[PDB]
Design a protein around this nucleic acid. Structure first.
Ligand SMILES: [Mg+2]
Ligand SMILES: [Mg+2]
Ligand SMILES: [Mg+2]
Ligand SMILES: [Mg+2]
Ligand SMILES: [Mg+2]
Ligand SMILES: [Mg+2]
Ligand SMILES: [Mg+2]
Ligand SMILES: [Mg+2]
Ligand SMILES: [Mg+2]
Ligand SMILES: [Mg+2]
Ligand SMILES: [Mg+2]
Ligand SMILES: [Mg+2]
Ligand SMILES: [Mg+2]
Ligand SMILES: [Mg+2]
Ligand SMILES: [Mg+2]
Ligand SMILES: [Mg+2]
Ligand SMILES: [Mg+2]
Ligand SMILES: [Mg+2]
Ligand SMILES: [Mg+2]
Ligand SMILES: [Mg+2]
Ligand SMILES: [Mg+2]
Ligand SMILES: [Mg+2]
Ligand SMILES: [Mg+2]
Ligand SMILES: [Mg+2]
Ligand SMILES: [Mg+2]
Ligand SMILES: [Mg+2]
Ligand SMILES: [Mg+2]
Ligand SMILES: [Mg+2]
Ligand SMILES: [Mg+2]
Ligand SMILES: [Mg+2]
Ligand SMILES: [Mg+2]
Ligand SMILES: [Mg+2]
Ligand SMILES: [Mg+2]
Ligand SMILES: [Mg+2]
Ligand SMILES: [Mg+2]
Ligand SMILES: [Mg+2]
Ligand SMILES: [Mg+2]
Ligand SMILES: [Mg+2]
Ligand SMILES: [Mg+2]
Ligand SMILES: [Mg+2]
Ligand SMILES: [Mg+2]
Ligand SMILES: [Mg+2]
Ligand SMILES: [Mg+2]
Ligand SMILES: [Mg+2]
Ligand SMILES: [Mg+2]
Ligand SMILES: [Mg+2]
Ligand SMILES: [Mg+2]
Ligand SMILES: [Mg+2]
Ligand SMILES: [Mg+2]
Ligand SMILES: [Mg+2]
Ligand SMILES: [Mg+2]
Ligand SMILES: [Mg+2]
Ligand SMILES: [Mg+2]
Ligand SMILES: [Mg+2]
Ligand SMILES: [Mg+2]
Ligand SMILES: [Mg+2]
Ligand SMILES: [Mg+2]
Ligand SMILES: [Mg+2]
Ligand SMILES: [Mg+2]
Ligand SMILES: [Mg+2]
Ligand SMILES: [Mg+2]
Ligand SMILES: [Mg+2]
Ligand SMILES: [Mg+2]
Ligand SMILES: [Mg+2]
Ligand SMILES: [Mg+2]
Ligand SMILES: [Mg+2]
Ligand SMILES: [Mg+2]
Ligand SMILES: [Mg+2]
Ligand SMILES: [Mg+2]
Ligand SMILES: [Mg+2]
Ligand SMILES: [Mg+2]
Ligand SMILES: [Mg+2]
Ligand SMILES: [Mg+2]
Ligand SMILES: [Mg+2]
Ligand SMILES: [Mg+2]
Ligand SMILES: [Mg+2]
Ligand SMILES: [Mg+2]
Ligand SMILES: [Mg+2]
Ligand SMILES: [Mg+2]
Ligand SMILES: [Mg+2]
Ligand SMILES: [Mg+2]
Ligand SMILES: [Mg+2]
Ligand SMILES: [Mg+2]
Ligand SMILES: [Mg+2]
Ligand SMILES: [Mg+2]
Ligand SMILES: [Mg+2]
Ligand SMILES: [Mg+2]
Ligand SMILES: [Mg+2]
Ligand SMILES: [Mg+2]
Ligand SMILES: [Mg+2]
Ligand SMILES: [Mg+2]
Ligand SMILES: [Mg+2]
Ligand SMILES: [Mg+2]
Ligand SMILES: [Mg+2]
Ligand SMILES: [Mg+2]
Ligand SMILES: [Mg+2]
Ligand SMILES: [Mg+2]
Ligand SMILES: [Mg+2]
Ligand SMILES: [Mg+2]
Ligand SMILES: [Mg+2]
Ligand SMILES: [Mg+2]
Lengths: 109, 72
RNA sequence: ACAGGUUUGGUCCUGGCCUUUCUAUUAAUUCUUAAUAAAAUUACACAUGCAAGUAUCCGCGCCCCGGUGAGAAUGCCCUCCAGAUCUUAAAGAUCAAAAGGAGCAGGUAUCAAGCACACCUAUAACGGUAGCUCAUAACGCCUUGCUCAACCACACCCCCACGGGAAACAGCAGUGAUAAAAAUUAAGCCAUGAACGAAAGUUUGACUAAGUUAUAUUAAUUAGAGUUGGUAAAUCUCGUGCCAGCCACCGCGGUCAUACGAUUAACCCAAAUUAAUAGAUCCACGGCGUAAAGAGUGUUUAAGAAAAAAAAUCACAAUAGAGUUAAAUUAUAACUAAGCUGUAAAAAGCCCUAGUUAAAAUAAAAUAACCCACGAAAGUGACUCUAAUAAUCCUGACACACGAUAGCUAGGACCCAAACUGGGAUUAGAUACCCCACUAUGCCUAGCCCUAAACCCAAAUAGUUACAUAACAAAACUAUUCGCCAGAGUACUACUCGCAACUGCCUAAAACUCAAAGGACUUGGCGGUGCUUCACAUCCACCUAGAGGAGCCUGUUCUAUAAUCGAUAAACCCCGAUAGACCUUACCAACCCUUGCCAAUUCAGCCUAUAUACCGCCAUCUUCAGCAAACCCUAAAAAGGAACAAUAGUAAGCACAAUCAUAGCACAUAAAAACGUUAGGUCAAGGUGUAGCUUAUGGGUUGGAAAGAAAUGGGCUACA
């Protein structure tokens, strides 16, 4: 605006980033509650294998399992990361495949 | 056109008024409920001062009137 | 940033989100060796071993190094130095506590007031004033080491450690618990530094040299990871069929997927490669008519900006008083007639109605006004009189004073209007639009409430018409100011603060969700918009003859059958059929035949699935006038492109038209009728792309089908 205004208001500061689902950490350890299924948003349709998990942050969170096929039993321990899934509403947490109770999605050779 | 912004407002307002009619008395509670907190916090605010200024009693001729609950 | 992708049928514009670059942890997949740097989840709890000694006593040393970042908006910077120590023939030097202040210093104003935060007396601890801080952010709250040859802070916790919990590795190694986060219970004082020593010297988990770890660079001995729709380097065949799955953004999968999973080639990085999460980087010296943003209005404070000119008058409707009434309407009488009112049409309603003639109150102010004045704005236009329109004139608030309608409180008023409500219609319904009553309420006096599309969506005050077209609208801009705007919702919302409000006003967020949301335009299409002109078997009005009823014929649709297919709004229904007893025949039932028509073929043959893969032939708009290359123009182009006293259009082609045929004319009919549209019709005329069948979805023989409860389309024959 004017100079006195730009003086009184200071220069603009770049606002600190809002921490996401992982609350700033790269990954999270988690424990399974109930394996289940969700339906995608409109233009595309499927059914995605989801879990409900608890995080070492003591928060419960809905997360996504990548790949075709898996074994996920209650009380299994998992690792999770912050990939958001573009199909579904509100699932912000992927499960890392290959660690703990989820082994690398199997090969059919 | 810009009506399409107004439509939203118009609706959001209408849908609010309707709400505040059904909810009226629930609302009325929670308003007065907080006024009785206000007046209390207010009181404590001053009480704090006697006790901070070393006096035992509230100073002479102090009834500490109720502002928030003022009616009629 | 040298930018790039992403809003729409498309075009700009505005505007987020994302990609592309570099670093760091951690994870997944791989991993050969050295060298060098770096080593770290945790002020959670700690087993054990060590991290201060020296030295003729005494003395001196003993968080100094070393560790950590818990705390505190801490602090940076700059003054000024008490004290401690060192040197020394008394003054130098190094640290530097306290105490200060030029200036700089995290977020938040939804934390706006704090509550004695000041001074004066030098009298010698008493008296005297009534102050101080604060919108240039006081006082709060929230988060946090840092501005780095270092500085600040802590040392089990109770900011401080007398005392209290209680028995302390935030020294080196190690260890439980915790966390996405994993170095040796390692050797030496040999160098440096430190402590003591007169000294040799002694001690030192500081440090030195190692040990461990792809954490980062370097060198080679080491080859692997990710990608391949687009942004963005790079693809073939299968499988799968909106499923399994993938994507950072746009998106991919619904039978032929370069987007999935797996091959095949490539691409690019490479002892690393991807993924994740944090950073660096990243708004606005840009804007505010239509896009997010000029507050409803004025004045002043604080704070600022300044050559000269800058008070002239109502063409008369500011405001506040007090008085007054012309038209109309109403009470209420006098007559007179039975109706009067009311709509598209009615009904209900009223006849204490209607017309006429009289006539107060209340309310509202035709024409003038084709005027454009007065007020700060809201607002103000019947008449008269009284009072009367700030500032020698810049800007200015959260302060002050006003602020349409509606609404609230008390009292009056009540012609007419009228939310509500009750009748009446309309309607599927009609809580509405139409009708009829009647109320709060519009009116006055006094007090509140403080909101508007309070909009001319265009801030104030001086200027200029220079420069100049995003679009549209009211053409473009300086200068001084204040106010306001950082995607869209969420949200004129939740909590706060204040208000004569207590379904209120004002101030005004976040979770979450999305990759948009917006402004202006462009061609279409559409319109129970408006205007003109038509319809010639054609909508209406009109004429004739029929269909719907009856019997029958014949086609669909349903039921029934072991027993075809196709068509099925206009553009199906005596339709493919100008044609089914066997045949046709594609169907069902049984039986049978396997190089099984042909010159040759691990080959024939298939009325099997795709008409949404198609060619063929057609339907349809359509007796509609347009389609389309080649160019040319438009202060830009999505697109448009004519005016004949002509203004940017020219153009061969295909349509129409013209000619042909109906045996001469003419008209009439026939024919013709592009481009496209309907993914319109038909893989059963035939032919084909893709798929399937191959001792059968192939080829033969023998029979068998086509029954009517109905429902309906078209015909025929009648009813004389
Ligand atoms: Mg992902
Ligand atoms: Mg809404
Ligand atoms: Mg409340
Ligand atoms: Mg848009
Ligand atoms: Mg599109
Ligand atoms: Mg559009
Ligand atoms: Mg996006
Ligand atoms: Mg690691
Ligand atoms: Mg230190
Ligand atoms: Mg340090
Ligand atoms: Mg901290
Ligand atoms: Mg604090
Ligand atoms: Mg502060
Ligand atoms: Mg000092
Ligand atoms: Mg709040
Ligand atoms: Mg005193
Ligand atoms: Mg302490
Ligand atoms: Mg003690
Ligand atoms: Mg400790
Ligand atoms: Mg240790
Ligand atoms: Mg210690
Ligand atoms: Mg451990
Ligand atoms: Mg590490
Ligand atoms: Mg040692
Ligand atoms: Mg080393
Ligand atoms: Mg390396
Ligand atoms: Mg190898
Ligand atoms: Mg399915
Ligand atoms: Mg395929
Ligand atoms: Mg891709
Ligand atoms: Mg693939
Ligand atoms: Mg590496
Ligand atoms: Mg910039
Ligand atoms: Mg403009
Ligand atoms: Mg706007
Ligand atoms: Mg906003
Ligand atoms: Mg204005
Ligand atoms: Mg104002
Ligand atoms: Mg407003
Ligand atoms: Mg002044
Ligand atoms: Mg000037
Ligand atoms: Mg008056
Ligand atoms: Mg009169
Ligand atoms: Mg009269
Ligand atoms: Mg009358
Ligand atoms: Mg009428
Ligand atoms: Mg009647
Ligand atoms: Mg007029
Ligand atoms: Mg006017
Ligand atoms: Mg004046
Ligand atoms: Mg002023
Ligand atoms: Mg008002
Ligand atoms: Mg009123
Ligand atoms: Mg009334
Ligand atoms: Mg009266
Ligand atoms: Mg009335
Ligand atoms: Mg009614
Ligand atoms: Mg209807
Ligand atoms: Mg109507
Ligand atoms: Mg009445
Ligand atoms: Mg009024
Ligand atoms: Mg107005
Ligand atoms: Mg307006
Ligand atoms: Mg406005
Ligand atoms: Mg102003
Ligand atoms: Mg002025
Ligand atoms: Mg100029
Ligand atoms: Mg344009
Ligand atoms: Mg927003
Ligand atoms: Mg409002
Ligand atoms: Mg509100
Ligand atoms: Mg306020
Ligand atoms: Mg006809
Ligand atoms: Mg016709
Ligand atoms: Mg008939
Ligand atoms: Mg008949
Ligand atoms: Mg049939
Ligand atoms: Mg049947
Ligand atoms: Mg059919
Ligand atoms: Mg068909
Ligand atoms: Mg058809
Ligand atoms: Mg026929
Ligand atoms: Mg037959
Ligand atoms: Mg057959
Ligand atoms: Mg089909
Ligand atoms: Mg077709
Ligand atoms: Mg075809
Ligand atoms: Mg033509
Ligand atoms: Mg053209
Ligand atoms: Mg002829
Ligand atoms: Mg002719
Ligand atoms: Mg013809
Ligand atoms: Mg012709
Ligand atoms: Mg079709
Ligand atoms: Mg059809
Ligand atoms: Mg065929
Ligand atoms: Mg073929
Ligand atoms: Mg057979
Ligand atoms: Mg037969
Ligand atoms: Mg019939
Ligand atoms: Mg007949």
């Amino acid at each position: 605006a004017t100079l006195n205004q730009m003086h009184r208001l200071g220069p603009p500061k770049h606002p600190p980033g809002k921490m996401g689902p992982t609350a700033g950490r790269p990954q999270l350890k988690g424990v399974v509650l109930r394996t289940f299924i969700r339906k995608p948003k409109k233009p595309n349709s499927a059914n995605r294998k989801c879990c409900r998990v608890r995080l070492s942050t003591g928060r419960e969170a809905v997360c996504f399992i990548p790949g075709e096929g898996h074994s996920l039993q209650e009380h299994h321990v998992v690792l999770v990361q912050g990939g958001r899934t573009q199909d579904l509403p509100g699932v912000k947490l992927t499960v890392v495949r290959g660690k703990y109770d989820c082994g690398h999605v199997q090969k059919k050779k | 056109k810009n009506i399409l912004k107004i439509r939203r407002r118009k609706m959001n307002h209408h849908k609010y008024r309707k709400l505040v009619k059904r909810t009226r008395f629930l609302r009325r509670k929670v308003r007065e409920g907080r006024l009785r907190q206000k007046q209390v916090k207010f009181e404590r605010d001053l009480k704090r001062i006697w006790q901070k200024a070393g006096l035992k009693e509230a100073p002479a001729g102090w009834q500490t009137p109720k502002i928030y609950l003022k009616n009629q």
